[PDB]
């Protein structure tokens, strides 16, 4: 089970910048992928992408989609290898 | 009435953690609800002590209490939270926030 | 070296169960009248040696289905 | 008082183990007595979960319960007991019969 | 890198205590009026970030004796 | 911390017969010695001697003495190296 890794703040946090991640996880628990980005009126700045743990909000959701109305940080999770490659918004 | 794992949707806003947890907005921690009633089912992982105490309680139900139903194993969850300087960062293995297994102790 | 026991109890996923040995146990909880469960057991052999008290009776055996025709 | 370790002299005769425990005749198991009251003292080893649950209970004291005070570490005791053939034999490390440390879970 | 805090609470073995940081915490348990403890803390820094709710207020700081002249409210 | 080891039933239980024992024990818990024997009207048959774990019945007790009135098996414990070399009876 794999996800898209990305971390804009990499230099600062001393981590890789972009790539992929194999998800370490509990025996009979589910695994997920996440993406999060900022949105300054249409201009999209990526913030982080990567693996995410058995959280029911992502349960059986094929595409990575954010649901919040108007957030500081947009967030979305999903289930299925590399499902976080592309992401979108719709409350 | 028996001892088991229960749903507990904690909403971070409810406990005022919305200030620094960006996601999720709520998550499944579980609850360990129910009584430890003799005889103690194997799937409750009774300790010797739990057994003994339970017996003693059967004899002195006013001086000694039943064993308690508690989380015996704990899964972590993932959370995206604001840095000390307001940078979205991620604890992927945020330890001990959700109930894995329940039991009597 | 498992065996099959009769299962008359709340924690019963069926009419019978499999385990290390079979149990018949009599209990007074809660002030109520005594109730008598029958089932499996693989955890605390020692309990069986228990001499019967005024509130509990643990009885065990290890032959097939050996806990049907038996009360206390 | 709060959440703490308490004396519990268990007498094997009382739970009908006098039939096979030759010695001791009684021994100190402890009890874990008391409430897990916010804020949770460090010496109670609160788990993350215990903290969260405690908070949620502060808001929904009727639907969600406090954390329980349970034994968190267990010492063994030694006992001299009758064989299956009535021979005095010794479990030196008879595990989990006495309370070592208490805590909130 | 410990520090010294004022200690007004039940779990207090003295008039002051030492720890990683100092706390002032306000709690409103069902039925009872709110009570305000002051003390140490070394376990769960996160709690401090807690925005104050209708039933609890966690406040922390890390200068010497910094939790005397200081009280709190709810919502 | 040491005790006198003895096990009449040794052959049967496949263990040494007599000697001594160094007591494996928990960090800040106490250690003790025990002895146990049968008494058929004055004639003393030994049954077992050895190490014994932090049990308050033995707390701060210099000599190995049994306290039960008239038992099937006489037992006694004590605190202090080889305190179970010699033992006695008095209810
Ligand atoms: C970045 O990723 C590579 C593998 O692609 C790995 O060797 C290295 O440990 C990573 N650097 C980190 C974790 O800082
Ligand atoms: C902001 O960003 C999203 C994509 O993440 C875009 O689809 C949306 O229309 C943008 N504008 C708004 C609603 O602020
Ligand atoms: C008997 O005692 C000796 C040391 O005194 C030891 O080396 C040996 O392992 C003991 N026997 C057994 C099998 O416990
Ligand atoms: C048996 O042996 C004990 C142990 O020395 C002795 O003190 C006691 O007097 C004897 N008991 C009787 C009365 O047979
Ligand atoms: Na013998």
From Swiss-Prot, chains A, F:
Taxonomy, superkingdom: Eukaryota
Subcellular localization:
Cell membrane
Q: How is it modified after translation?
A: Phosphorylated. Constitutive phosphorylation is in part catalyzed by its own kinase activity.
Glycan attachment sites = 16, 39
Q: Which cysteines share a disulfide bond? A: 3-33, 23-51, 58-77, 64-76, 78-83
| Residue numbers on the Extracellular membrane side | 1-91
- What does the function comment of this entry state? Transmembrane serine/threonine kinase activin type-2 receptor forming an activin receptor complex with activin type-1 serine/threonine kinase receptors (ACVR1, ACVR1B or ACVR1c). Transduces the activin signal from the cell surface to the cytoplasm and is thus regulating many physiological and pathological processes including neuronal differentiation and neuronal survival, hair follicle development and cycling, FSH production by the pituitary gland, wound healing, extracellular matrix production, immunosuppression and carcinogenesis.
Q: Which disease is it linked to?
A: Heterotaxy, visceral, 4, autosomal: A form of visceral heterotaxy, a complex disorder due to disruption of the normal left-right asymmetry of the thoracoabdominal organs. Visceral heterotaxy or situs ambiguus results in randomization of the placement of visceral organs, including the heart, lungs, liver, spleen, and stomach. The organs are oriented randomly with respect to the left-right axis and with respect to one another. It can be associated with a variety of congenital defects including cardiac malformations.
Assembly and interactions?
Answer: Forms an activin receptor complex with activin type II receptors such as ACVR1B. Interacts with VPS39. Interacts with DYNLT1. Interacts with BMP3. Interacts with BMP2. Interacts with BMP6.
Family statement:
Belongs to the protein kinase superfamily. TKL Ser/Thr protein kinase family. TGFB receptor subfamily.
* Protein known as: Activin receptor type-2B
Q: Which organism is it from?
A: Homo sapiens
Source taxonomy lineage? Eukaryota, Metazoa, Chordata, Craniata, Vertebrata
Gene assigned in the entry: ACVR2B
Curated annotation (Swiss-Prot), chains B, D:
Disulphide linkage map: 3-69, 32-102, 36-104
Q: Posttranslational modification, per the record?
A: A reversible disulfide bond can be formed between the two subunits in the homodimer; this has no effect on GDF2 activity.
- Fill in the subunit field for this protein: Homodimer; disulfide-linked. Detected in extracellular fluid as mature homodimer, and in complex with its propeptide. Interacts with ACVRL1, BMPR2 and ACVR2B with high affinity (in vitro). Identified in a complex with ACVRL1 and ACVR2B. Has ten times lower affinity for ACVR2A (in vitro). Interacts with ENG, forming a heterotetramer with a 2:2 stoichiometry. Can form a heteromeric complex with ENG and ACVRL1. Interacts with type I receptor ACVR1.
Q: Which family does it belong to?
A: Belongs to the TGF-beta family.
Gene label: GDF2
Q: What is this protein called?
A: Growth/differentiation factor 2
The organism's lineage is: Eukaryota, Metazoa, Chordata, Craniata, Vertebrata
Chain segments carrying region Interaction with ENG: 78-92
Say which domain of life the source belongs to. Eukaryota
Its biological purpose? Potent circulating inhibitor of angiogenesis. Signals through the type I activin receptor ACVRL1 but not other Alks. Signaling through SMAD1 in endothelial cells requires TGF-beta coreceptor endoglin/ENG.
Could you tell me in which tissues this protein is expressed? Detected in blood plasma (at protein level).
Location within or outside the cell: Secreted
Question: Coiled coil: which residue ranges?
Answer: none
The entry's linked illness reads:
Telangiectasia, hereditary hemorrhagic, 5: A multisystemic vascular dysplasia leading to dilation of permanent blood vessels and arteriovenous malformations of skin, mucosa, and viscera. The disease is characterized by recurrent epistaxis and gastro-intestinal hemorrhage. Visceral involvement includes arteriovenous malformations of the lung, liver, and brain.
Curated annotation (Swiss-Prot), chain C:
Region: Mediates specificity for BMP ligand; residue ranges are 44-47
User: Where is this protein found?
Assistant: Cell membrane
Q: Which domain of life is it from?
A: Eukaryota
Task: Kindly list the cysteine pairs connected by disulfide bridges.
Answer: 5-22, 7-12, 17-40, 48-60, 61-66
Which regions face the Extracellular side of the membrane? 1-72
Residues annotated as glycosylated are 69
Stated consequence of mutating residue 18 to P = In HHT2; loss of receptor activity in response to BMP9; retained in the endoplasmic reticulum
Sequence similarity: Belongs to the protein kinase superfamily. TKL Ser/Thr protein kinase family. TGFB receptor subfamily.
* Assembly information from the UniProt record: Interacts with TSC22D1/TSC-22.
Q: What is the disease in the record?
A: Telangiectasia, hereditary hemorrhagic, 2: A multisystemic vascular dysplasia leading to dilation of permanent blood vessels and arteriovenous malformations of skin, mucosa, and viscera. The disease is characterized by recurrent epistaxis and gastro-intestinal hemorrhage. Visceral involvement includes arteriovenous malformations of the lung, liver, and brain.
Described function = Type I receptor for TGF-beta family ligands BMP9/GDF2 and BMP10 and important regulator of normal blood vessel development. On ligand binding, forms a receptor complex consisting of two type II and two type I transmembrane serine/threonine kinases. Type II receptors phosphorylate and activate type I receptors which autophosphorylate, then bind and activate SMAD transcriptional regulators. May bind activin as well.
Q: What is this protein called?
A: Activin receptor type-1-like
Species lineage: Eukaryota, Metazoa, Chordata, Craniata, Vertebrata
The gene behind this protein is ACVRL1
Q: Please state which portion of the whole protein this structure contains, as first and last residue out of the total length.
A: 30 to 101 of 503
């Amino acid at each position: 089970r794999e996800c898209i890794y990305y971390n804009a703040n990499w230099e600062l946090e001393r981590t890789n910048q972009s790539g992929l991640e194999r998800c370490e996880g509990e025996q009979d628990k589910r695994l997920h992928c996440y993406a999060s980005w900022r949105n300054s009126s249409g201009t999209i700045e990526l913030v982080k992408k990567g693996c995410w743990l058995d959280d029911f909000n992502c349960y059986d959701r094929q595409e990575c989609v954010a649901t919040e109305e108007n957030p500081q940080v947009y967030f979305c999770c999903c289930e299925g290898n590399f499902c976080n490659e592309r992401f979108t918004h719709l409350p | 009435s028996h001892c088991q794992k229960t749903s507990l949707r904690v909403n971070f806003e409810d406990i005022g953690w919305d200030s620094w947890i960006i996601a999720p907005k709520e998550y499944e921690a579980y609850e360990c609800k129910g009584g430890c009633f003799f005889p103690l089912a194997d799937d409750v992982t009774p300790t010797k002590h739990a057994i003994v105490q339970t017996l003693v309680h059967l004899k002195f139900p006013t001086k000694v209490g039943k064993a308690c139903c508690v989380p015996t194993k704990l899964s972590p969850i993932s959370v995206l939270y604001k840095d000390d300087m307001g940078v979205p960062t991620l604890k992927y293995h945020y330890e001990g926030m959700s109930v894995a297994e329940c039991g009597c102790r | 070296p498992l065996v099959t026991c009769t299962c008359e109890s709340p924690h019963c996923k069926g009419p019978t169960c499999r385990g290390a040995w079979c149990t018949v146990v009599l209990v007074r909880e809660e002030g109520r009248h005594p109730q008598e469960h029958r089932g499996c057991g693989n955890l605390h052999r020692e309990l069986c040696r228990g001499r019967p008290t005024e509130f509990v009776n643990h009885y065990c055996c290890d032959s097939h289905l050996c806990n049907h025709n038996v009360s206390l």
